Symmetry: D2
Subunit: 463 residues, 4 copies
């Protein structure tokens, strides 16, 4: 069998692992999203072209580096690479643009903290990547940038940066050093009226944030486990607890979670990843992460495309080995009851999908909310979302296993007939890229009248 | 809270019990069906009228007694009692009519000048069983006759021979030239024509006698809805019934009676060809040790649950009520477990055919079953299905499971299903929602056969079809809603699930929608 | 396979059922205890002898009837029938003797020259209920006499009055300065000295008599007190008070017979030794549709707390008159057992019916099967989970002994016990292997019948010089006994639980032996 | 609370995660074992001393390199560092010695220079005696003659950690004309993999035989066998191992498809299994290892045999004083997966941070283990485990259950071979399993099992077996106190037998301290 089905039917977790099969080829669209950071190594349009084709979904601007002019070009490039496949509505792959806020970093001069002597005033102690170590009139590690010490979250610059972001129609803000819920209100304030549209993904990068995680989760659209700083700010042995914990809470709350930093580092320099790294990816996926990310790997290294091609392979397998069985069960039980017709339909659509090994669930969505309520349960069938809002169609990448499709055609006269052309559009698209073959069954989720908020029907159709 | 919700939310089975509340008033239509047997105590229309109001759902004809003329009258009466409430399509309660085949019985002679007379059998007494046309009548206390000749060549020295209801007991302590000479291991008053069983003995009687055939033919002729088949012992036996039923009655459901070892042994082949099963505790508790029935019942109700087919739990659930206006603790308790075991319906015999308290008997089944059902631990139960249930590719199954799950999510009050044959209602109850499954159908027959299914509530839709299929479907749906409101399954504000199809005709259900009332 | 093993391995409850086998002969001591009430039908010694051999474990004195002198004789007869098998220490089956407190009953009078003669109460007719002692002996179709004086300043007009097992029925329409004037709502054939129930309508739990009765109990060495109409934990403190210093030994089994009791059931569980679900009065005091929930609930909480629970009244009624039980009745037993019941009981069936021995032989059969169909799997699991942690070497061993038993399909767990405590902590988990308890205290060896699947063996031999060697003769004694009565055959494994030094409270060792 | 207890009591896996606490200090012996490979970076006695103190448990000789004389010295050093703490029988930490068989490698020739191979550029692969050292940017020589007859036209050929890639483009008379599909700096005598070729090279060469003979002669405790591909292969090793060493545990390395394919037959005949991510990760797609790992650890768990997770768990430390996030997290999952021990290679043999590499595997494993969800876990075994009639199985399960009931601090077992200790850890108590034995060897082999802490008992036997058994028990408790596994008031479980000798465990007792 394929997609680890035998292992998907085991009665306990153990037997399940006992049943994983290295010759059980996956056969599914990979559903974890890929965020690639744009940098010299990947700024050109041609390179972008390739990285999409490889599976990129979200491009990341790192405002820790580079002028505004510099990033203006980056967006401009992404967008161009992207529209180069406007070629064929059935294959067009939207790409998000996320701006990674620079935040209150602490760099150093171009041992007495002030080779022997070293821009955060009230400092009055680790330099670079945490390889260098000094202790308070102080040096405990050696070595030939960041400065982390186990400031305002929103500087004048940060503000300036978000304004830029709004002005340029970025889709997502990854917010650096969120340490308390007031901090995301800040971002959202700076973002201004013109941009309630933009998802806020709070970065967790230190103890306090870890500590106040719950308040933070409640006000954000999602979370980023920033193992980079976090893994210096706290003992390096503990991160795996913060990640696992955070992915889990996030999973419960129905919000997209991102696992970050050093998942494929060696590739910065080399054409294959270590065994550690490969295995780092599978587990982030198995853990529950919504999307997994690349930095050095894509921004400066000799193998940007290859980096992306891997996350894509690893994630495919990983996702074929998820123990939905225990997993879906666990949710229903944990999920509180609900009276909102959309929740209700989605849980239905999902149960339905399991009963028949549905190939996909197809949902007309305006904002994507309903797409999202389908993946809260983590179907295994693909969630194909047909929408006209190129933006929703993009933001929908923050959600496991939802595959946006942007629908261009001008509305029919008759609502009924339009809905149907949008559905069938999904199916067509579906066939074309190979999510469904004739004979398959498919679930289709829709509404009883035009506009967001009214999803409430589920239907079973054979292809 | 009501309907045992807090016990419905317990993390384990044990906690769940620990949480049952005797001041947690149920609040749901009872969903185990009640079969009442019609007899003198309940053959009048007025009485019939009462017993429906009390919750009867299926009337049972016991072709082990009485002429065809006699049973004609019974149908004729049910039907009349039943249309006495045609008075409001929203309250009209269809009722099944089930013919309980008489099968290969072994009753005894009519006593000495006594169709009323009772001899009295004494412990430690020689008794002659005979097969002589002579003693056909000539019953005494030292002699009995049996309508099953071959019994001499089939009971060996030492074997036990049971008379009337297992209550009277005898052991063959001498085979020879005419009688079998037995010692009365069991005492008590014997009648005319009572029942005989010979455990550990292999009975050879055809499942389907000429009569049995005759009876089915009558049944088809009069439009009964269900055949309960006595003594089914192997799947060829139901092919028999269905054969005799003839072309004019593929419509009729066949409910194989399990009444002995062999049948229990070949239970699987049996289950596969029938529409359901009846656990016939009566004979089955004489045919095997009486300590072992409870296993046959619990096993059979389980397998049946799995297969998706309606199962019935039978005989002596309320016996003391044949004589008495209240049940023993045993009896009350016996019902709750039938329902907690999984039983699709639970039945009444003496209790409704003979006894001084027919209506009351039915009122009780109804109360008991309400509580038992409120006390069902769906939680573990639904789970266990999904898991046991194999995968399926049939759009209907798929919808039903969906509808169901959807109903849990919102505490849906009802699932409304348009159905032509009932199939689709059935697939909804296979999972045992807890919301009521209201089935709107134009086939008065299906609408009746649907009573064999836990928590389905037929509504017969009369109106002639609209021009536009769409509009028709919608008047049928709303019909259900109206009905629903009227009898109190749903109040404004409630949510409801509606299950329908994409084109006219059976076999195409495939849509599920959520509507507020 | 036997003992429903294939159904014992099923992955869910459902498949478990799906796999019960009527041709899967049990092969296990039955572990639910049988309580038989003693009465004329079962008072003789020879009958007694028979009923033991059939499986009786506990004889029940019903102090609702019969003088002290009468019950004295009964005990004296049990004990004799019992010691008639002292003849082989390896077979001897101890029997308990339990006294069933009469409590705050309400019964009618004897009939107008009618100790076994009946009036016939007719539906819709006037019945004069009376409190006048002059009429005590004057029962007719128009007058029932009741031994509860206050019934007149307690039962309101409109009120209902059930008579004889809730079968007769009477509605109070006028309070009189000398009695009640009711219209018969339900009629039937009314006899003498019959139980009266005034539901929804000051009788002390412990009357002077009750006290008198316990004193008798203690005086004669009864083992258990089944306490009628316990409605609140202060009621058992009362019984225990009356039982007095000479009897802390005696187990107290609080009887649940009404709403309040059901309502306060927790406080009552906590102070008693066990509980009896008295379906009789319970089934009249509350709606009859609800008992099955007070039974299921009570059995469960009891199961959780580690306390024996008893399932009572009308399990085999038709046998009072008939040589076979109804299909209801049979299936009532199996569920009591499948529910969790520690012991299941007979009353009419054994005290006044024509089939006492048979009654007992059925409860025995039914319960053997029923115990072969318990779903331990989910069961043992649920316990460990529910059970709190514990730091008491005995719990800790027992849980161990038990898990160990499961691993190997142990045939039995053999336990040395002085008081039986340790036997009990083995059965809290409901092993499936039999818990054989070797003890020198004929009393513990008896009280240990309150516990599911513990089979006492009374060890007579005078102690060896060497503790070690004594322990070992007591173990091996168990094994011998076990072989003899068929709990274990060569090749079986066995678990053996014991202590590191003499006296109660020190169990702490578990060992695996092959036979 | 500590040791992730609140997360320990969650009703489902998810809640369990939701409940992990980064301020919930662990408080338990780490129970995953640490194998560290001895190399220049860690061959001195002083360094060895340090590495033990940091947690090392098993030392690995890699017979892929270095003469016998060379490994003789390594043993001779381990042993010395080790007995440097014979100084207090309560602290002494035994250390295994494991011989990592070299096996059927294909390695290249000699040029510290590195000819650089370039993408596109044609490479000639040879087996020609004469070009043994002539090899160049355009010529690589391999020590496996047959490479030419067995790599079909268009088969791939990797060189060095799969970093160089070559597709056979033609096969002329004197060898493989490939095309450098992946380029790189190439070194000397470097490892070469031919996936989807059917290599005919014998598991057990003459050398391999020679090597085990050395192993036996010198008393190594464990053989990690390279490139086990079928059960007949371990019989070989066991044969070579010879009569004088039935003692030695054989741990079959899994390093390729076939092995992964026959994994069952292989599991049944070995003492354990090594998931060799190195070769395995080049022999199959690299995206698939995590399923070989997860699968093999799980089956292994079921079977009751110790499993090792191998290769590149901390790589960057070869060069750096801290691990990458990837690497850290690689360790925790090995542990959460079920791994019996986790291993170090470059990190301990060649790198600039041997002691540190060991310190980290220690810290990560501590937490990983505190965060184990026994709850679901123990359950899952009992259910999976088939029934058993062996009194030792039965006691262990029992001792274990017992340990959960009272938050036993430790399970103390007298063991002769260690088997019974092993059956205690099959269930993964959470109390430590302290094993008192007189066989310094078992006491070392025992480190292949999660959470078993050998204690070597020296004293000569009492007259009275009873009394002996008791001094051995109490010995544990003493030790136990001394190193802090147990404090007064603690409860403890003790497992023993009814008579002297292996095979007869059968008693379980509860004692308060
Ligand atoms: O943005 P959401 O919340 O997913 O809403 C999905 C909406 O899409 C629809 O299916 C179609 O809406 P439009 O016709 O406005 O495009 C609605 O029925 C439903 O309300
Ligand atoms: O009898 P079944 O198999 O339940 O089929 C139910 C049928 O009822 C419908 O909802 C309506 O059918 P009709 O219009 O023929 O009455 C169909 O869509 C569906 O096929």
């Amino acid at each position: 069998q394929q997609q680890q089905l035998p292992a998907a039917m085991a009665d306990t977790f153990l037997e399940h692992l006992c049943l994983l099969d290295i010759d059980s080829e996956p056969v599914a669209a990979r559903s974890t999203s890929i965020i690639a950071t744009i940098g010299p190594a990947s700024r050109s349009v041609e390179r972008l072209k390739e990285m999409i084709k490889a599976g990129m979904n979200i491009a990341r601007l790192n405002f820790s580096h580079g002028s505004h002019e510099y990033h203006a070009e980056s967006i401009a490039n992404v967008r161009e690479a992207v529209e180069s496949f406007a070629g064929s509505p059935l294959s067009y792959r939207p790409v998000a643009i996320a701006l990674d806020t620079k935040g209150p970093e602490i760099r150093t001069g171009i041992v007495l903290v002030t080779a022997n002597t070293v821009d955060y005033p009230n400092i009055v102690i680790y330099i670079d990547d945490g390889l260098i170590s000094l202790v308070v009139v102080t040096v405990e590690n050696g070595g030939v940038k960041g400065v982390n010490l186990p400031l305002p979250g929103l500087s004048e610059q940060d503000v300036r940066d978000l304004r830029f972001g709004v002005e340029h129609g970025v889709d997502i803000v990854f917010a650096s050093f969120v340490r308390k819920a007031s901090d995301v209100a800040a971002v959202r304030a700076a973002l201004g009226p013109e941009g309630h549209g933009i998802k806020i993904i709070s970065k967790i990068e230190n103890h306090e944030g870890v500590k106040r995680f719950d308040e933070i989760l409640e006000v954000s659209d999602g979370i980023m486990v920033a193992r980079g700083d976090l893994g210096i700010e706290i003992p390096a042995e503990k991160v795996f607890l913060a990640q696992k914990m955070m992915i889990g809470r996030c999973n419960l709350a129905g919000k997209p979670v991102v696992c970050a930093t050093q998942m494929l580092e060696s590739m910065i320099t080399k054409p294959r990843p270590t065994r550690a790294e490969t295995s780092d990816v599978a587990n982030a996926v198995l853990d529950g992460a919504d999307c997994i990310m690349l930095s050095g790997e894509t921004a400066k290294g000799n193998f940007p495309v290859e980096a992306v091609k891997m996350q894509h392979a690893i994630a495919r397998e990983a996702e074929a080995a998820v123990y939905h069985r225990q997993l879906f069960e666990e949710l229903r039980r944990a999920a509180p009851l609900s009276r909102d017709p959309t929740e209700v339909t989605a849980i239905g659509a999902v149960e339905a999908a399991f009963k028949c090994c549905a190939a996909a669930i197809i949902v007309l969505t305006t904002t994507g909310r309903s797409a999202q309520l389908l993946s809260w349960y983590r179907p295994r069938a693909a969630v194909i979302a047909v929408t006209r809002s190129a933006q929703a169609a993009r933001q929908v990448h923050l959600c496991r296993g939802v595959f946006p499709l942007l629908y261009r055609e001008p509305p029919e006269a008759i609502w009924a007939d339009d809905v149907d052309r949008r559905v069938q559009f999904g199916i067509e698209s579906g066939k074309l890229r190979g999510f469904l073959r004739v004979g398959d069954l498919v679930i289709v989720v829709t509404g009883w009248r035009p506009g967001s908020g009214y999803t409430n029907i589920m239907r079973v159709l054979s292809i």
